[PDB]
Design an enzyme around this catalytic site. Structure first.
Site, PDB file in Angstrom:
ATOM      1  N   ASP A   1       0.907  -1.005   0.034  1.00  0.00           N
ATOM      2  CA  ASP A   1       0.053   0.021  -0.148  1.00  0.00           C
ATOM      3  C   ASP A   1       0.870   1.218   0.071  1.00  0.00           C
ATOM      4  O   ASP A   1       1.619   1.377   1.015  1.00  0.00           O
ATOM      5  CB  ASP A   1      -0.792  -0.161   1.164  1.00  0.00           C
ATOM      6  CG  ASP A   1      -1.964   1.342   1.466  1.00  0.00           C
ATOM      7  OD1 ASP A   1      -1.925   2.106   0.070  1.00  0.00           O
ATOM      8  OD2 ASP A   1      -2.831   1.232   2.114  1.00  0.00           O
TER       9      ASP A   1
ATOM     10  N   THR B   1      -4.402   1.235  -4.492  1.00  0.00           N
ATOM     11  CA  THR B   1      -3.376   2.479  -4.535  1.00  0.00           C
ATOM     12  C   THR B   1      -2.228   1.931  -5.420  1.00  0.00           C
ATOM     13  O   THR B   1      -1.382   3.041  -5.934  1.00  0.00           O
ATOM     14  CB  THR B   1      -2.848   2.880  -3.127  1.00  0.00           C
ATOM     15  OG1 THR B   1      -2.217   1.538  -2.340  1.00  0.00           O
ATOM     16  CG2 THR B   1      -3.872   3.181  -2.341  1.00  0.00           C
ATOM     17  N   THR B   2      -1.822   0.667  -5.761  1.00  0.00           N
ATOM     18  CA  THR B   2      -0.665   0.390  -6.718  1.00  0.00           C
ATOM     19  C   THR B   2      -1.118   0.768  -8.082  1.00  0.00           C
ATOM     20  O   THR B   2      -0.260   1.032  -8.795  1.00  0.00           O
ATOM     21  CB  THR B   2      -0.417  -1.337  -6.533  1.00  0.00           C
ATOM     22  OG1 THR B   2      -1.612  -1.957  -6.438  1.00  0.00           O
ATOM     23  CG2 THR B   2      -0.154  -1.313  -4.947  1.00  0.00           C
TER      24      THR B   2
ATOM     25  N   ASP C   1      -9.184  -1.895   2.772  1.00  0.00           N
ATOM     26  CA  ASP C   1      -9.510  -1.130   1.648  1.00  0.00           C
ATOM     27  C   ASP C   1     -10.604  -1.637   0.602  1.00  0.00           C
ATOM     28  O   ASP C   1     -11.380  -1.133  -0.024  1.00  0.00           O
ATOM     29  CB  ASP C   1      -8.165  -1.419   0.800  1.00  0.00           C
ATOM     30  CG  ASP C   1      -6.983  -0.471   1.494  1.00  0.00           C
ATOM     31  OD1 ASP C   1      -7.395   0.518   2.382  1.00  0.00           O
ATOM     32  OD2 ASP C   1      -5.867  -0.513   1.078  1.00  0.00           O
TER      33      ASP C   1
END
Lengths: 192, 528, 487
Positions: free
Chosen positions: B49, B82-83, B385
């Site tokens: 993350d 988020t990657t 997430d």
């Protein structure tokens, strides 16, 4: 007379100028019993609610073990009698100035106001009180002796807007219209 | 102080942001892997993350803090994947250096990107997926298999797909003036060592991890209408006065009178009827023995943040001190709530009270069991997430195919859009279209495959879709398979990502690259 | 390959440190701690926690041994190497195949399922209540320590403990072993070790005139001359024969409490007061005035005096519980008088692990060949499925067969035998005659484990290997490492 409110989160498209009193700081939120305030008086408290602690040396002679809890009962009664006159005046909104100076507040003031359904907010700057007194028109209360219903203001409804985790207090409507109103706008942005 | 002007600032800023960006690019896609950070203070966290990594990583040049705040904004918007998000704006700075060397004005570079994203909103609406669209059995399971990507938990997808979906069905509440939405962040996730993910338990409600202080206290409470009381009042020997201070028998009577009232304060809780009582601060065996005779389940060493969600979900009034309008210390019956079913179950050599059927505020908790802490470090942040994607899925039915389908499609729309605007901004659209294609190319780099072979074939299938408006289907096709290296529709593979996640990804990425392009010089004042 | 070398070399040197911790031939290694002292032991659980390494990636594996001890409670004798042994054969992978570790994840999952089937093939049931096989089974796990001399006597304490303080709630043997206390007394012999029903304390008596002996004990767990005297009268109102407090004892309280004929102790930790409260039935008293008749002692037969030549210790004789069942909480202890601190620290680690191993014995009554025969038995089928596989995944899959052969190889290097002809004979004998063939613990022969008398439970083989494989994927899932983050 135009105050810029800085709040993190949202976009500039969400920026809207409020037609009434706005509060940037929130309440203690520990009790958080009442979820809304409507048709209630909004007071301005220039003093602080604490057990008496004069600046000079204070020596309380305790000759009996029952006097200890009696002092606690006196601290509960003395601080509640101030709230009794506030409840008698039907004022559910109270604004306290900066609480980190001297007296601050005890932990028993929450249960007293939560039972009476009175919202309280602290940590307000002295310059902010002068700005809020112009638009709201409420006469500030510097002590319980001068506290009365004529000094207290009024509002139609007070809604607390919660967006992106940031809560803000909004007051809709003004009771007494004065000659020096104030306006404010809440700036919404991604970062500072 | 130290002030440098010219291209030296913009060159050192791009090379600094690109160096730290290439480190997190190895986590892109399902084939990505976690990495370790050495904090030199003794603490370490292994995760993919970027929100936590960019916050922990020390930013050398002050221009790198802009991308750090970009990851913090994604948490308030989406927070998952988020990657695949924060690395998009990192490629815009590499191709920007070639445009700065040209005669194109920096604002023209900005203006070219503004009209590109503003028009890209309609480009997404063309490939936009409706609420029904594909089969979508529960429509959550199809998205649940997508949330398993970008993470190392994809091997457990046979379970987690049912875990997250079945748990969040009871989270629906009525708030925001009659708006139907899931109160995200109200879900409590528990971790347990041993066995595997198949031992996890779904709790349609709140579940607190704790046991009874004394083993002689009853550990089982069954039936309905179970009342709970959260008491934060500290029970301990009271301290002295302001320092004025004060027959040792009368001095010891102070503790005798106080502890006598403490026993009376518990008797007021007995008359309330609550089955479960909570206590924050610890107590001795004197006050613990009174809880045994009270026939009420107590708990000590309680966290304040755990009890705040109890009063919200159940509806009972949290009592930090016992007081009323008079000078009498007691507990009123109006401070207690009601619940449909409350029972304590034994799980993983421990026990937890399951609070279900909360009338005031409905929520759910997920109790998961896993290998160990280090193995659940990635599984923790990943499941937290994934709660936002399921929220955004049922809040807005708009989704988009993942795996590089959007980036490969936007290139075709911008090819005809570049010739439309023309003039000097045509080159900016070409560089902006080629920068979006870098993300799917780096996807096969982590998979050790050939991306250009797939992009050339994949774009040709999206081109045959746009070139023919009337279309049976001899042309239209989409999707990219990483394992087999073939083009197949994602309806069979089951990879779909919400549209709101990708729109806000490119919306925030616009101002991220502009913040760097607007920096003429950087000056640093020495500290005192 | 920049960040991959740091992760491989982190756990590479760990295998050589714990290589001497396996088998009955296991040896010791001297380690110099940063505190300035020395730690010499063959147990890695205390070593891996107190060791300081430069690479933090190896520190993540130091907690894997603690996790296996909390969840399972075995493996410190053998499997402790298996936690770091998997990464040994994974070195010729990135530097050779240059393939992402994701392929290994699918290779280990297929090898894990096949490994569980081989263990079930050799699995055999055994009676947990019968002391025939359980006597040699307990001595099998602890036979790697100095206790070999007293292993006949040490097995008697462990065999009688699992049948007494365990009981049950119905689910298995489930109970808590932490409340069971084991007293360690240095010097002398273990011949005086008995099973005692009450708590022993190492603190002396505060008063010289008080005589030490008791028939029916009463246990109480706790201007100035007259005030303390009135406090002593409140303590002596129930006529207690024993007074225990966590704080000090003033000289004034020695004379006042002497009139009641009681014993007074000092400097008693809260850990002992929690056990005395359960054993003696008394309730821990905070406020002195709270002492009542409910604190009287219960089920204490006799009180005696055990004294070292230096100072006086508290000793309570054996007793019983009148019946005239509730195995969740039991009150009892095992007194252990050790000869020297070297063997005394090993028995405490053995007795706690023996009760932990015997726990897993009664959790899964099935039994499997031990002593290194199972690891070679799996490698026969694990390598056979590799030739039947015949695919890209064969290379990481067949490399696991080397890890199964290196587990008994560590015992060979510790014993001093020739692994070449020995392991070549095992692979040929297991694939033909039977899987029961294994390595002798001393001579290193082809003698079977059936007649040799060493066995290991199925849950010990399944859970330890499954955990080690899943824990080995930790560093395999780490593609990069960043130094100098400065949180």
């Amino acid at each position: 007379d135009i105050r810029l409110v800085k709040k993190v989160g949202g976009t500039i498209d969400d920026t809207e100028m409020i037609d009434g009193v706005v509060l940037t700081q929130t309440a203690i939120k520990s009790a958080g019993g009442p979820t809304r305030k409507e048709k209630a008086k909004i007071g301005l408290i220039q003093f602080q609610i604490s057990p008496p602690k004069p600046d000079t040396e204070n020596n309380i002679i305790v000759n009996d073990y029952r006097q200890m809890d009696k002092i606690l009962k006196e601290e509960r009664a003395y601080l509640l009698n101030i709230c009794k006159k506030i409840k008698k005046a039907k004022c559910n909104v109270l604004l306290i100035q900066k609480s980190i100076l001297r007296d601050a507040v005890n932990d028993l003031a929450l249960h007293f106001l939560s039972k009476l359904n009175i919202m309280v907010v602290k940590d307000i700057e002295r310059e902010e009180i002068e700005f809020l007194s112009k638009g709201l028109g409420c006469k500030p209360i510097a002590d319980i002796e001068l506290f009365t219903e004529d000094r207290l203001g009024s509002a139609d409804l007070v809604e607390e807007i919660d967006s992106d985790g940031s809560k803000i207090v909004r007051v809709t409507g003004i009771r007494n219209n004065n000659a020096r109103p104030t306006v404010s706008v809440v700036i919404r942005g991604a970062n500072n | 102080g130290e002030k440098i002007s010219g291209d030296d600032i913009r060159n050192q800023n791009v090379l600094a942001t690109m160096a730290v960006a290439n480190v997190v690019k190895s986590s892109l896609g399902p084939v990505g892997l976690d990495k370790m950070l050495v904090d030199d203070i003794g603490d370490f966290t292994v995760t993919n993350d970027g929100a936590t990594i960019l916050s922990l990583l020390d930013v050398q040049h002050p221009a790198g803090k802009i991308l750090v705040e970009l990851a913090q904004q994604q948490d308030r918007e989406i927070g998952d994947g988020t990657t695949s998000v924060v690395i998009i704006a990192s490629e815009l700075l590499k191709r920007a250096n070639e445009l700065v060397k040209n005669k194109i004005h920096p604002t023209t570079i900005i203006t070219g990107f503004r009209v590109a994203l503003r028009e890209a909103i309609r480009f997404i609406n063309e490939v936009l997926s409706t609420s029904v669209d594909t089969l979508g059995k529960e429509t959550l399971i199809n998205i649940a298999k997508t949330s398993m990507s970008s993470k190392i938990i994809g091997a457990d997808s046979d379970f987690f797909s049912n875990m997250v979906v079945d748990a969040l069905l009871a989270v629906k509440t009525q708030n925001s003036k009659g708006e139907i939405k899931y109160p995200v962040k109200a879900v409590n996730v528990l971790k347990a060592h041993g066995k595997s993910a198949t031992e996890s338990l779904l709790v349609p409600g709140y579940a607190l991890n704790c046991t009874v202080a004394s083993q002689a206290m009853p550990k089982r409470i069954a039936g309905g209408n179970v009342k709970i009381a959260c008491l934060d009042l500290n029970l301990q020997k009271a301290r002295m006065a302001m320092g004025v201070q004060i027959d040792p028998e009368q001095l010891e009577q102070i503790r005798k009178r106080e502890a006598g009232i403490v026993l009376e304060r518990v008797k007021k809780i007995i008359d309330a009827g609550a089955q479960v009582v909570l206590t924050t601060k610890g107590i001795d065996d004197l006050c613990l023995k009174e809880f045994v005779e009270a026939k009420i389940m107590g708990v000590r060493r309680c966290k304040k943040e755990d009890l705040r969600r109890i009063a919200r979900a159940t509806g009972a009034t949290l009592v930090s001190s016992m007081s009323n309008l008079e000078g009498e210390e007691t507990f009123e019956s109006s401070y207690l709530g009601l619940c449909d079913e409350v029972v304590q179950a034994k799980f993983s050599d421990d026990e937890c009270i399951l609070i279900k059927g909360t009338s005031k505020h409905s929520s759910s908790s997920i109790i998961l069991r896993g290998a160990n802490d280090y193995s659940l470090d990635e599984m923790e942040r990943s499941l937290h997430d994934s709660l936002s994607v399921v929220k955004r899925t049922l809040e807005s039915g708009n989704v988009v195919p993942g795996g590089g389908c959007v980036e490969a499609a936007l290139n075709i729309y911008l090819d005809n859009f570049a010739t439309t605007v023309g003039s000097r901004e045509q080159l900016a659209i070409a560089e902006f279209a080629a920068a979006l294609l870098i993300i799917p190319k780096t996807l096969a780099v982590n998979a050790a495959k050939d991306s250009s072979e797939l992009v050339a074939k994949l774009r040709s299938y999206h081109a045959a879709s746009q070139m023919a408006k009337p279309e049976r289907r001899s042309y239209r096709n989409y999707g990219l398979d990483l394992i087999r290296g073939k083009i197949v529709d994602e309806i069979h593979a089951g990879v779909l990502e919400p549209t709101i996640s990708k729109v806000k990804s490119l919306k925030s990425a616009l101002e991220a690259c502009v913040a760097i392009l607007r920096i003429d010089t950087m000056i640093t004042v020495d500290p005192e | 390959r920049q960040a991959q070398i740091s992760n491989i070399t982190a756990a590479k040197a760990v295998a050589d440190v714990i290589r001497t911790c396996l088998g009955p031939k296991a040896m010791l290694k001297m380690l110099l701690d940063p505190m300035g002292g020395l730690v010499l032991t063959n147990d890695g659980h205390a070593i891996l926690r107190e060791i300081d390494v430069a690479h933090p990636a190896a520190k993540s594996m130091l907690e894997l041994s603690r996790t296996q001890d909390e969840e399972v409670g075995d493996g410190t004798t053998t499997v402790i190497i298996l936690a770091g042994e998997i990464l040994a054969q994974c070195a010729p992978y990135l530097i050779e195949k240059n393939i992402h570790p994701v392929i290994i994840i699918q290779a280990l999952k297929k090898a894990l399922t096949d490994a569980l089937e081989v263990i079930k093939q050799v699995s055999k049931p055994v009676d947990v209540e019968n002391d025939a096989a359980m006597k040699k089974l307990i001595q099998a796990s602890i036979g790697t320590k100095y206790v070999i001399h007293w292993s006949e006597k040490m097995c008697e304490l462990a065999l009688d403990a699992v049948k007494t303080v365990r009981k049950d709630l119905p689910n298995f043997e489930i109970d808590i072993k932490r409340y069971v206390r084991v007293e360690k007394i240095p010097g002398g012999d273990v011949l005086d070790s008995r099973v005692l029903k009450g708590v022993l304390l190492n603190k002396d008596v505060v008063h010289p005139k008080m005589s030490r002996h008791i028939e029916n004990p009463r246990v109480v767990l706790l201007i100035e001359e007259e005030q303390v005297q009135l406090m002593c009268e409140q303590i002596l109102a129930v006529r207690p024969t024993l007074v225990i407090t966590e704080k000090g004892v003033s000289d004034l309280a020695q004379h006042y409490l002497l009139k009641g004929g009681c014993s007074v102790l000092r400097r008693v930790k809260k850990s002992d007061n929690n056990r005395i409260a359960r054993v003696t039935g008394a309730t821990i008293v905070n406020r002195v005035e709270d002492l009542k008749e409910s604190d009287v002692g219960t089920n204490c037969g006799l009180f005696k005096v055990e004294m070292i030549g230096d100072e006086y210790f508290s000793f309570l004789d054996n007793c019983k519980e009148p019946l005239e069942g509730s195995g969740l909480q039991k009150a009892c202890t095992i007194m252990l008088r050790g000869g020297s601190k070297d063997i005394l620290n090993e028995i405490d680690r053995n007795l706690q692990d023996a009760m932990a191993v015997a726990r897993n014995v009664m959790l899964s009554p099935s039994l499997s060949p031990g002593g290194g025969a199972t690891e070679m038995a799996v490698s026969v089928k694990l390598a056979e499925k590799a030739k039947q596989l015949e695919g890209i995944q064969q290379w990481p899959y067949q490399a696991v067969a080397d890890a199964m052969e290196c587990i008994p190889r560590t015992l060979i290097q510790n014993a001093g035998g020739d692994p070449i002809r020995l392991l070549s004979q095992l692979r040929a004998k297991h694939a033909q005659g039977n899987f029961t063939t294994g390595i002798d613990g001393d001579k290193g022969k082809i003698v079977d484990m059936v007649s040799y008398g060493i066995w290991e439970p199925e849950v010990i083989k399944q859970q330890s290997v499954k955990t080690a494989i899943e824990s080995a994927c930790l560093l395999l899932r780490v593609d990069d490492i960043v130094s100098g983050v400065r949180k």
